[PDB]
Amino acid sequence: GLPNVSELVDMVYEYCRKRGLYPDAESYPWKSNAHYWLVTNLYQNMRANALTDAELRRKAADELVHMTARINRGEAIPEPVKQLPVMGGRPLNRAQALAKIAEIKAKFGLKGA
Amino acid sequence: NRAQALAKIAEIKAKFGLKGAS
Amino acid sequence: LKVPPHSIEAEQSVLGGLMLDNERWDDVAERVVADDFYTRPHRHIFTEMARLQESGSPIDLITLAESLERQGQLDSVGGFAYLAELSKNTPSAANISAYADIVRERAVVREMISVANEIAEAGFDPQGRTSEDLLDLAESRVFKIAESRANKDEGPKNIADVLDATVARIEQLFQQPHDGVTGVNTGYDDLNKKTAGLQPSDLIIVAARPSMGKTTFAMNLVENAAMLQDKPVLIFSLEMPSEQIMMRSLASLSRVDQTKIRTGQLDDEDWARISGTMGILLEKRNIYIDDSSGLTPTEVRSRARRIAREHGGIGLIMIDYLQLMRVPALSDNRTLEIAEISRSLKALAKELNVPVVALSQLNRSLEQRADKRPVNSDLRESGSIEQDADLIMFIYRDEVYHENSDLKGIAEIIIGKQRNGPIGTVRLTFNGQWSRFDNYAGPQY
Amino acid sequence: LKVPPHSIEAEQSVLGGLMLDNERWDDVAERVVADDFYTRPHRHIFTEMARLQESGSPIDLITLAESLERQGQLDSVGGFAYLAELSKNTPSAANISAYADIVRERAVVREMISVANEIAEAGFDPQGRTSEDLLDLAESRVFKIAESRANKDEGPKNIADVLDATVARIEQLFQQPHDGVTGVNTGYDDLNKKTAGLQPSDLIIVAARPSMGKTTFAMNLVENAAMLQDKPVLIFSLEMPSEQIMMRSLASLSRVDQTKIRTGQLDDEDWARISGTMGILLEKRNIYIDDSSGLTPTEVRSRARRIAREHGGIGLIMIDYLQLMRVPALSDNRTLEIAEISRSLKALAKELNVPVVALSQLNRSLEQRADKRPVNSDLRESGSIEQDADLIMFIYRDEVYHENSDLKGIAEIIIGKQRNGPIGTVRLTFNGQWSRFDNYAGPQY
Amino acid sequence: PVVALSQLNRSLEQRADKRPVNSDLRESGSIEQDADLIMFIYRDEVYHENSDLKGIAEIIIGKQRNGPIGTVRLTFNGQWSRFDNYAGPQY
Ligand SMILES: Nc1ncnc2c1ncn2[C@@H]1O[C@H](COP(=O)(O)OP(=O)(O)O)[C@@H](O)[C@H]1O
Ligand SMILES: Nc1ncnc2c1ncn2[C@@H]1O[C@H](COP(=O)(O)OP(=O)(O)O)[C@@H](O)[C@H]1O
Numbered sequence A: 001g002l003p004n005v006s007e008l009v010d011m012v013y014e015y016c017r018k019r020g021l022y023p024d025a026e027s028y029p030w031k032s033n034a035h036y037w038l039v040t041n042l043y044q045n046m047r048a049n050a051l052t053d054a055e056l057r058r059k060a061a062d063e064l065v066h067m068t069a070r071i072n073r074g075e076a077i078p079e080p081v082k083q084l085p086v087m088g089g090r091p092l093n094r095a096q097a098l099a100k101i102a103e104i105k106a107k108f109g110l111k112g113a
Numbered sequence B: 001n002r003a004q005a006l007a008k009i010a011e012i013k014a015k016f017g018l019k020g021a022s
Numbered sequence C, D: 001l002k003v004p005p006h007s008i009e010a011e012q013s014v015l016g017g018l019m020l021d022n023e024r025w026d027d028v029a030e031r032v033v034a035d036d037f038y039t040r041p042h043r044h045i046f047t048e049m050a051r052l053q054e055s056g057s058p059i060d061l062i063t064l065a066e067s068l069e070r071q072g073q074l075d076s077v078g079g080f081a082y083l084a085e086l087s088k089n090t091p092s093a094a095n096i097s098a099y100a101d102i103v104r105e106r107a108v109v110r111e112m113i114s115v116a117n118e119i120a121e122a123g124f125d126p127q128g129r130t131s132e133d134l135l136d137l138a139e140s141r142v143f144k145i146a147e148s149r150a151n152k153d154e155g156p157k158n159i160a161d162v163l164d165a166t167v168a169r170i171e172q173l174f175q176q177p178h179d180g181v182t183g184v185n186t187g188y189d190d191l192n193k194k195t196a197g198l199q200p201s202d203l204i205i206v207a208a209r210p211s212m213g214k215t216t217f218a219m220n221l222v223e224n225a226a227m228l229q230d231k232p233v234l235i236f237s238l239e240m241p242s243e244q245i246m247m248r249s250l251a252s253l254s255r256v257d258q259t260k261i262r263t264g265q266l267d268d269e270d271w272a273r274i275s276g277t278m279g280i281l282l283e284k285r286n287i288y289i290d291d292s293s294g295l296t297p298t299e300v301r302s303r304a305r306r307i308a309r310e311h312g313g314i315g316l317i318m319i320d321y322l323q324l325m326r327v328p329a330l331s332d333n334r335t336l337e338i339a340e341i342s343r344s345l346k347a348l349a350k351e352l353n354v355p356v357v358a359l360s361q362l363n364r365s366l367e368q369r370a371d372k373r374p375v376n377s378d379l380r381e382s383g384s385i386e387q388d389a390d391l392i393m394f395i396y397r398d399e400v401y402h403e404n405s406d407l408k409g410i411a412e413i414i415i416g417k418q419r420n421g422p423i424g425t426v427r428l429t430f431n432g433q434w435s436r437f438d439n440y441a442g443p444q445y
Numbered sequence E: 001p002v003v004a005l006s007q008l009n010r011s012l013e014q015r016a017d018k019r020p021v022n023s024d025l026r027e028s029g030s031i032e033q034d035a036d037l038i039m040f041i042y043r044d045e046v047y048h049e050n051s052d053l054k055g056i057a058e059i060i061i062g063k064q065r066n067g068p069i070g071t072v073r074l075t076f077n078g079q080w081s082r083f084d085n086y087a088g089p090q091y
């Protein structure tokens, strides 16, 4: 079930404290998509409006009511928004890189390099 | 079309355009 | 004894024509000024006549001589007898315009001779000045005379001729399609459609808050212009060394991660891409970069002129950014410095017939509003820039302010002032991984 | 008399120094040309020396004299007597490059004077030429003097030169393995990854509210730079006397409790540790401290230049803090003073090619926000600092504001502006007992 | 050593807790910046007649250049216009 106002505020504060190390918001270990959306929205609203504790609780209650109304009427929550893959796979050694640099220098004939 | 548009362009150039024109 | 070229006969003819014909004053007014007269009495006479004409009073012999007599300035001029001789000697059937033009030309020649004498005297007695300072001084001295004579090109035009020229221009634009691009191609379809390219002889200002991709957007425009043309493209960077600019350009062109390039963690394919990019750049060879710090408008203008002279044309000029430029003569007031910078940039744009893109910055006050999208009034302290600018583009990114924005990787270019087209907002894709801007493939509104 | 600018002694020095030392020829040849010399004999001598250099022959006294004698031109030069005079008067303590540059300067000034005279002469004798033609002639004459001149160091280089410099820099960075650290090692792995070290020619700002550890962090960085380098590290401590700084440094390095050091209640092991630290410092000998107060940027620049001159360069410069610096000419307006300070610090960092870390302070209003972690807008009254700084780091300690914090002993370095990389937060462990920062060993997200 | 006395702003008396902080030195930022040591005097009986701390004063170190900060309790004898060492138990 959806958390109450106090639990939502506590989760928002915990996310604010602990998001300084995660690469992105989607990488946070969210319990569910709705929790991610609510916590992120509250965090951004607080960041952009300097909301106090009471204002944060009021915004959390409003977001919970809006989410409950949306759930009661149906609708399916998509999986976050996602942003790019992780890439990887670079097994390059120093010797090959130096050989490539020397080949580049020979091909382009750089006087200063 | 484009041909008619250019024809009307030339017609207007002849009718009003003078001296400098294009 | 050197004889400066003075035409006393032309000045006397102008004065006599004005005395015997008050309708022609305007023709004289647009051809000569008070300082253009050699003898002091003639300058004083012209000043008194200008005052009388602006007050609505007749400029006949009696009133002019009497007015000089009342102020006690009649004796210095030469007297009522001298005024009557000037009035009577000049025949009525004379063309005052030719004499006024001769007097106008003589003042320019005299100023040129004065500047040459000043330069020679300064060279003989340096008084600690450097050669570079003397060269800059000589360039400034000559350009002052050039602009002093480059003010006649502005004036009213005939309505019918303007209408005919406008119709011809409309027909020509609809005649030569170029797929909607008339100026320098921006490399982006929507921007080309909304701008018809970058128009030559027009000042372009790019403004944004810090970390919005302003330098990135300018470099993308420069690279697109270089790849889509043949004329050289010049870059003035007062904030970055040229090596970082080239690294950013390599990341953008090769579509390789900038962090990998910066840290050196590149694989074989990345090296191949970089080699290809370098090969293309060395085959083209039309990009010039100047990373000097503390640039002055004179140095920028001189280097642009030298490039255009050497290669017969400039595709585009880019300056980043104008808030770092200096005018030593006006360091006391920043607004005057900005106005001088803007005027010099506009003069350079007109002279070389090239598009000039100057980057600017916005005050923190913009961030005090609920909606942080830039507006024209956010160009405070740079009113001259807003007025003299032919194109004004602001860069906005919603993801910068909001982490949970739905427009992540999307940037908005907002045209706050367009001289020859409509204003609006253009959405683009921002690949910060490659440090690049691309055409937006999503829905447009 | 208006004698043209010339210096016979400088030319004599150049020719004599070339006669006595032939390995300097290149330095003379890269600075002077045969037409830069005023007297005909000097031009002829330089031409003959150039020919001898091209043929592969030495250009000493006897070879030059013999080569001139074979062509019968020894009398035009002045004779073997004059050649011997040139050989004799010039000492072997010759800075031939300086004299060559001076000769170049005289020639430029002389040519400028000649061109000014020609322009004036053309102005006084139109010969049927319009004023437009005379202005074009004047522009052409001044342009040929100024055309490219010799300022290749401070001019827009070709794309080839910039690309080659960038590739050489890339190779140099990839040559020595440091595991992604190109600048001065900060001593912390995550901060090194995020910043790639402290880059040379960059302005770095460290900001925090009072009692957050600005001075502590700066001293820790200084200690790490001294331990991980060989070049001198200079400190400008406008806040504390040097004795207290050294006490803090001993507490940090030896990991001895600060209260024990301050009260003198140490034991044998602490004394042994302090002795070891002193031994290490005296073996290294690369830390210099200046605890003066009210320093102007001019004094800071002068002292840094003097230190670099005396000890072969600098490895780091630290200022604590910039609010204590003074610009007497701008004491009326604080914003202009801060702008001047930031500009001077950036210029110094670029000139000495060293990282400069300057401490700053934040407005009180930050303490009224719901979240007290600093942002860029918290640098109020110091917008020029945000504009000019290459790197901006904020120190945040949660336990300062919250007694019940779960992050006791944990500090955050927040990169508010990283010019050449990403931004974010780096966590470190704060040991106030030893007055030290250490790498955070806890779990990382 | 130079000991200069200074005042605080009146708005401090409108807060829930009236013990001074550094930000309570408004109009005097340079005072906070230049002072090596800053000590605030606080008597609870001045604001509350019900105070259990009658005769007890607190010296609050708002800024200490070379040491810790905190509160030191002393005894206030207004009869003799004197401060004395606090003889009560210390936590
Ligand atoms: N004797 C001490 N013991 C433990 N911590 C101390 C001591 N003195 C200072 N500190 C810590 O150092 C931090 C910053 O002090 P300092 O660097 O002197 O001021 P600033 O950060 O304004 O330069 C404070 O937060 C404080 O907790
Ligand atoms: N290594 C990087 N990784 C991701 N983004 C970067 C990197 N370097 C720069 N950027 C982005 O480039 C943008 C523009 O930076 P910059 O050109 O320095 O500022 P401005 O556009 O105001 O001149 C910033 O918003 C920043 O997020």
Ligand SMILES: [Mg+2]
Pocket: C215, C239
């Ligand atoms: Mg920039």
Ligand SMILES: [Mg+2]
Pocket: D214, D215, D239
């Ligand atoms: Mg301090």
